[PDB]
Amino acid sequence: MNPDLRKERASATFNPELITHILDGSPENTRRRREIENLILNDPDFQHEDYNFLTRSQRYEVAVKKSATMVKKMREYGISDPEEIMWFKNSVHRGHPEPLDLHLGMFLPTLLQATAEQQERFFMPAWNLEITGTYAQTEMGHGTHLRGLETTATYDPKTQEFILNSPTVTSIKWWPGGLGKTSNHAIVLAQLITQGECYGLHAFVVPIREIGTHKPLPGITVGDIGPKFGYEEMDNGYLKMDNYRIPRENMLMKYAQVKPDGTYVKPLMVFVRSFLVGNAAQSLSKACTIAIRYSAVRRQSEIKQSEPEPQILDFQTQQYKLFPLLATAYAFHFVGRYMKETYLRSELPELHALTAGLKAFTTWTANAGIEECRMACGGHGYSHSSGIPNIYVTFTPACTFEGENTVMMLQTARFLMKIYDQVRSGKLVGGMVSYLNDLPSVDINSLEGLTEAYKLRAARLVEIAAKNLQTHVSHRKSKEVAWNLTSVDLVRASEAHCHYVVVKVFSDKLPKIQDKAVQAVLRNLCLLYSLYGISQKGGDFLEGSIITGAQLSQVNARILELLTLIRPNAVALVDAFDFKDMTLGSVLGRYDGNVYENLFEWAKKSPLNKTEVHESYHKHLK
C-alpha cells in the first residue's frame, strides 16, 4: 500500500466498516454484497479486456455475452432477491450499461399489464431468453410529450389484427435500449385507433425479428441509433413499422381491452426516481473516491519552498473542490434512503411532487460534481485511466431520461403553487411543505439553525414565484402563458424546496447513528453541505433577510475550518463506500494507491501500442 494512502487511513477517527454497514442497510447486507461481488470477480465467464480497449462493436458484444450468462447464472444460483439481483448485475457489468436492461427491467415486468393467456405465451419464452425483448416508448419527435406520440395501432375488424404504423420520420421509435440489435420482440406504445376513434396510448407486443435468423420481419426497419457520448455497450435503437400486422391478442389488455368486433372497453414513477437518486449518489461517490485517493497520492508544487512537494490534498483549493462534493454524496445517499423509506410507508401528490424534484436536484448536482472530480485530478483525470470519464458519460443521461430535469422541477413547482394557493385560501397544510403555513415571507452555528435557514429560503422563493406568476396572470389573463413567464422563478422555488429537504433529511439522520465517531464525522459533512449551499447561494438568504452579511462571512470562514477538520478522514470516508477496484475502473483511484507503475502498464496494454509502428506511418509518413 502506498505510504501516502496508509498515513491518511491511519489518521482516520472512525471505523469506515461501520459506515459501509449503514450504506448497505446492515452488516449482513454488506457481507452478502461483498460475497456476491467475489462470486462474479473470480468467475472466468465474466472476465475480459478493459472496455476502453475495445471498439464499440466489441463492447456491445461482450455486454451481450455477459448479460446472457448473467441471466443463466442467477437462475442457476437461485438469485431472486431484487437487491441481490442488483448487486449481481452491477458486479458483472462493472457499472456499464447492458443490452438486456429493458428486457429484464420492463419487458418481463410489464408482462406481469397483461392477461394470463398472454403472460403464458410471451413470458416463459422471454424468461428463458428464447425471446429477447424491449420497451419502445420514445420517438424521434417526442420524448417528454407522450400525448404527441405518432405511432398508431389501428384495429382491423376483418382480420382481428392491429396495424402498427410509423407514418412519419419523427414517429420512428428512438432510443430504446436493446431495441437496436438485441431483441426480437418489442412492447410498443402506440395511439390505439378502432371504430374510427382514437383512445390514446396503449401497449402492444410486437414481434420484430425472425426466430433463428434474427432477421427483421417484413414491414420492420430496425437498427442502432449510432454512437453517443457514452453508452457504448447499449444498442439504443430505432424502429419503423410499415403498417405491420399483429394479432388482436397482442394488445396488453389487463386494464383496457378491444373486443373482436373492435369495441374499445374500460378501464374499469416514484420507484425509478428513488433509484435515480441513489444512482446519482453512487456515481458522485465513485468520482469522489477516485479524486480524493488520487489527491492523497499526487504530490505536486509546494506550500513551503523549503519543504518537499506536498500531497495535493494539502491544498485548501483542492479540499474545497472535493470535500463539499464528498458531503453531497453522503447527503444524497441518505436522501435516497429517505425516499425508499417514505415510499414503502392523501400524501401521494406530495410524494410524486417531491420525488420528481429530488430526482432532478440530485442528478444535476451529481452531474456537475463528477466533472469537478475529474478536473481536480489534473491531466491524468482526462485519461480513461482515471475512470471518471466513463462514470460521467454513463451517469449524465440521468438528467435527461425518466423525466427531463427542468420538466420535473416544474412538476414540483405546480405542487408548491397548489399548496401555496391552499394556504392562501385558509387551509392548513402538512408534510414537508408545512413551512408554507408561515407565509407571507436563525443560527448559523447549529444544524437546527441551518435547517431553519434553508426552510425560510424555500418559503421566500416560493412566495416570489407565486407573486410573479400572479402578476402575469393578472396582466395577461392566460394562466398557461403566465406559467411559462414565471417558469424560471418556479424552477428556482422547486430547487430551494428540494435543497431544504436534503439538508433536513441529512440532519435528521445524524441522531440515529449508533457509533459516536461515525456520527461526529458525518455531522461535519452535514455541516459542510449545509454551509456550502448557503455560501454558494448567499444572495437568496441575504435578499430574504434570513441571515446578515456578517453571518455569510462567518459561513465562509466556517466552511474552510471544516475542510481541515474533515481532511484526516477524507480517504477513510471514501473507502467506506467499499467500491472494488474493478468497479471504479480507475488506475488513479486504486485502493492500494500504487498509481504510477499501474498507469505505465495500462498504457502499454492499450490498442495503439499493439505494434511499435502504426500502419499510418508506412502509408503517409515513410
Place this chain on the structure above:
Amino acid sequence: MNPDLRKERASATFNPELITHILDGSPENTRRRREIENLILNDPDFQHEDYNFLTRSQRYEVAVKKSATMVKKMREYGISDPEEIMWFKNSVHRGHPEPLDLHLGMFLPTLLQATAEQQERFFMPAWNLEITGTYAQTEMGHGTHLRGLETTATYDPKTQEFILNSPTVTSIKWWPGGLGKTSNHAIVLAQLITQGECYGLHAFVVPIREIGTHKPLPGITVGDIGPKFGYEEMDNGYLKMDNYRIPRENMLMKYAQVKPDGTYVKPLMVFVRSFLVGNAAQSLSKACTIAIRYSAVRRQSEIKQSEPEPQILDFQTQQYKLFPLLATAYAFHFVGRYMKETYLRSELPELHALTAGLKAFTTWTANAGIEECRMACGGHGYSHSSGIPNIYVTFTPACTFEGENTVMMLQTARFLMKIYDQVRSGKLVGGMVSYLNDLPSVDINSLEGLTEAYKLRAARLVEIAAKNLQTHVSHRKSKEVAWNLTSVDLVRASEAHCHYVVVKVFSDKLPKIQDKAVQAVLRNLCLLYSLYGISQKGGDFLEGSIITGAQLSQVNARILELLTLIRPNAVALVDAFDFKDMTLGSVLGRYDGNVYENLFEWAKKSPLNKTEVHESYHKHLK
C-alpha cells in the same frame, strides 16, 4: 430550409453578415476565410468517413493522412500567413485535434532557441516532413511543477555527448501530442547536469525512432498513453530514455551553452493564453449555435393546451439556459480580441497576471456552458449527432493544460495582493487595477452602472482576500502557509477581477460598433451577460452593500425581459458565427434545419448497422 428556422431568421433586426465581419476583423478576412474553407471542403484529399464512425486507430490514421497532406498543400498554395494557416488547419481537421500539432506549433518554432548550425540540420528536414517532431515537457509525475521534472541530461566530457535518462516511472515523459507514434524526433526538456552540478531545465533534440523503419531506437521506449475522454486522433505519448546518448550539439544553445570540456555558460505564455480565450469563445459559440438552432426546430410539450406544441425556444427556461451562454460567447470573443490588441501594444506583470486569469475564467465558463447546451437539447443532445459531445471533449482539456486553471487564478491573485500592498503603502497604481486606489471597501439600469458594480465587487473580494491572508500571516507567521489558508478567497478575488474586466471590455466595445442594429443587439447581450453575472452571485454584491435586495430582484426581472427581447435575434446571432455544417459536425445544428430526415440517415450509416444482425447474436443469443 426548415420553415421554423426561416421564420426566426426573418424576425432578426440586424444583418448577421455585419457581425461576421467584426468577428473576422474585416470583410476581407471573412471573404478570405470562407474561400479557404471552400478550398478544403471541395478537395477530395481531405474528405472521409465521419470520425464518430471510425475506431480510434482509424481516427489517428486519417488525422495523420490529412495533416501530412495539409503541410504539402499549404506549401504548394504558398500559404504563410499565420491567420490563414489557422483557418486552413481548422477546415481540414473539422475542429478535431491533429498529430502534427506540436511538430508545427513547437518543434519547428523552437528550432527558430537554436543555433544556426542546428537550425540548418534539423529544421529543413523537419520542415519537409523528412523528420517528424514533438516537444516533450510533462512527465507522469509532474505537469504543473516544472522544477520537479526528473528527466536528466548528463554531459559526458569523454565522448562529448549528453546522456538522457528517465530514472523513475514518474520521470517518463507523458502527454506530448505526436510523441506516441508520429514523431521520430523530440525536443526533450531535462535537468542539465555537467561537471557534477545541475543547472536546471534545458532543451535537447532527441532522435527517438529510426529513419525508414520508424522503429524505436536502442534505449528508447515510446508509445501512446491510451484512450482518453477525447482526443481520439491525437497520439499523446510517453517516452522513457535509458541513458540514451546524443551529441553535445543537440542541446539548444541559443541562450545557454555547454563547452566541449563540459563548462556550463550563460545565459548572457500570453500568446497561447490569448488563443485559449478565443478557443473558449469559439467552442462555446459552436455549442450555442447547435442548441439554439435545434431549439428553434424542436417542438415539444405545450404552453396553451389549445395550441400546437411550440418550438422549445418559446420556453422561458430554455431561453434562460441558452441566451446567457450566447451572451457569454460574444463577451469572450471581444475579451480575446482585447487581449490580442493589448499584447500587440512596466505593464508586463499586469499583462501576465490578467492573461493567466482570463484564460482560466473563460475556459471554465465555456466548459460548463458547453454541457448546458448539450443538455438543453434533451436526449438527442447525448448522441454524437448533436455534435456537442465532441466539442466538449475536445475543448475541456483547455482548463487543464497551458496552466491548470486554479494555479492560474492563484497567479492572478499574487499580482492583486502585490498591487493591494502597494496601494496600502501609499502608491498610486494604474491599469485595470486602478480601482484598488479606492480601498478600503450604482445604477442597475445602465451598462456604466453595471460595470461600476462589478468593479466594486472585485474591490470588495480583493479586500477580503487580503484581510484573511494577513490574519493568517499574523497568527501563523509563515506567508507560504498563510497563502494556502487563504487560497480559496484569493481565487475568488481573481475570478471577480476577471469578471469585471470581461464586463468592462464588452461594454467598452459597444460604442465602436458602426452598424446601429448590430450595436443594439450586442448591447442586449452585454446587458444580459452583466445582469446575469450579478444574479448568479447576488450575495457578493449584497454583502458589500453594492446593490440592495430590491435592485437584485430588479436585476432578475430585467434578465427575463431581455430574453424575450433577444429571442427574435437568437438564430441570426448564432448564424453570425458563420460555422459551416462540417465544422459543427452536427445534424441537430444544421444550417437548413432539416434535422429528422438527416438524423435517420446518419443512424443508418453508423457502424453497428453495417449488417442487420450483429455477430453477437449468433454467438450468444441464437
